[PDB]
Structures are given as C-alpha cells and as structure tokens.
Amino acid sequence: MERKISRIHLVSEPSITHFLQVSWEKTLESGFVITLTDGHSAWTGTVSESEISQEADDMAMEKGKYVGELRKALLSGAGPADVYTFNFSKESCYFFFEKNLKDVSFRLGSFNLEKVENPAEVIRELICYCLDTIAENQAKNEHLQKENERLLRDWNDVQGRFEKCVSA
C-alpha cells in the first residue's frame, strides 16, 4: 500500500495551500483513493480502474502515457518544463486538473468527491503518517551514518598497514 502527499494551490482561492493525498494499492493503474484537505474540512473520493480506462480512451492516447501524466501531475513528480493547474468547486463538489501550455490548457482529468463528516479523524491520520515517516527515515539515516563512520575507520587502518607492508 502506497501513499503520497503533495501541496497544491487551487486557482479559485490562490492564497491558501491545500494538501492532496493519493493512496493506491500496488500501482496507479489499479485505482486509488484521493483525499483533498484544507485543514478544516476535507473531501474524499475513490477512483476505480474503469474510470481511468474510460478517461484514457476518450483522451485518445495510450494508457501508459496517460498514467505517466497522472503520476507526474498528482504525485508532485513535475519536472522543470511543465506547469499544471488544479481546480475545485465546493458548491458542486467537482475536482479537475489540467495542463497549461503557452495559453493552452488541457483538461487532463476530473473526479467527484463526497465530503467526509468528521475531518478530525482524517487530519489526525495524515499527521500520524507524516510523523511516522519522519521517525523511520531518521532511524535509517542514523544507522547508515554509524555504518559509514565504522567503515571509514576500517579503511584508514587497513591502508595505514598497507604502507608498512609495501615498505618492508
């Protein structure tokens, strides 16, 4: 099970950062669960494989590149030469993301979200995941730092002995 959190600036209110989390089972192809949270009230929704396939077919492009574009869009994988635009309407509960290009936008995709009735739980879960991840990464970093210190000491010692070996 995989999850990715990204920051976004909705064009409707371009002054507050909203946080979008995408959770998928084994790959982005199978489907995913999208949760968009603004810190007070959040919206959640589910997208199945069938919707992705239909969107790809209508878009008139191969599935691989459509999945690549989705990954580069939602999963913060954008490179330098690409600017995207996300849109959300709360009154209609509609979400859609497009790709801007020199005054030419392309409606890459569109989902529908249904509000969650207790934002506290989802906010708490997201913060919990973030804290757990930082803890685990810190553990790994400290471990490999210790390993490198040990190995460097070993290398110093062995080369020091090699000098004498060659001299003799």
């Binding site: 209508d58 878009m59 008139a60 492009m61 590149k65 690409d82 005054d103 936008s105």
Partner: protein, 100 residues
Amino acid sequence: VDTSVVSQRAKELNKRLTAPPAAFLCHLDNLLRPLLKDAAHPSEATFSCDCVADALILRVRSELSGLPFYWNFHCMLASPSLVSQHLIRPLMGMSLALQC
C-alpha cells in the same frame, strides 16, 4: 478560413483543449512549417487524406508537450481563377525566363 471557424472546429475535435484562436493558429504554424520547409525533421506529425464526391479531408495528428493535437482541413475544389493564378501563369513565366 477565418477565426470563428477555427475556434468552432478546435472546440469540436480537441474536446479537452481550451485556447484562443490566435494560440491555436500559432501552434498549427509551428507544427506545419517545419515539415513544409524541410523534410526529415524530428517532429511528430502524421497526415492522412480521405475523399468525397468533390471535397478532400486532410487529417493532421500530432503532439505538443506530448499531448494530442488534431486538425482537419476540409478542402473544396479550387476555383478556375485560383488554379490559373497559382499554377498556369507562373509556370509560363518560368518557362519563358528559362528560355531567355
């Protein structure tokens, strides 16, 4: 073709594209001019032709930023004056110049 027809056709074919006519024509020029000026260019632009009683549909499929871009030319048989002024008279002038 003028601007309104371009905008209508662009909305129809490219359902998910939303651009002003000026930008669309600029992109079409950037897509076509490289091929017309010189071949063997490393650009993705496939062409096809259909036929009807009189008309010809020239279909252009390409990609910009890797995303699809379709256009169709609905060409009707050219008027006698246009064919004359563009082929018959210039070719006669060319022949006379080469003879000189």
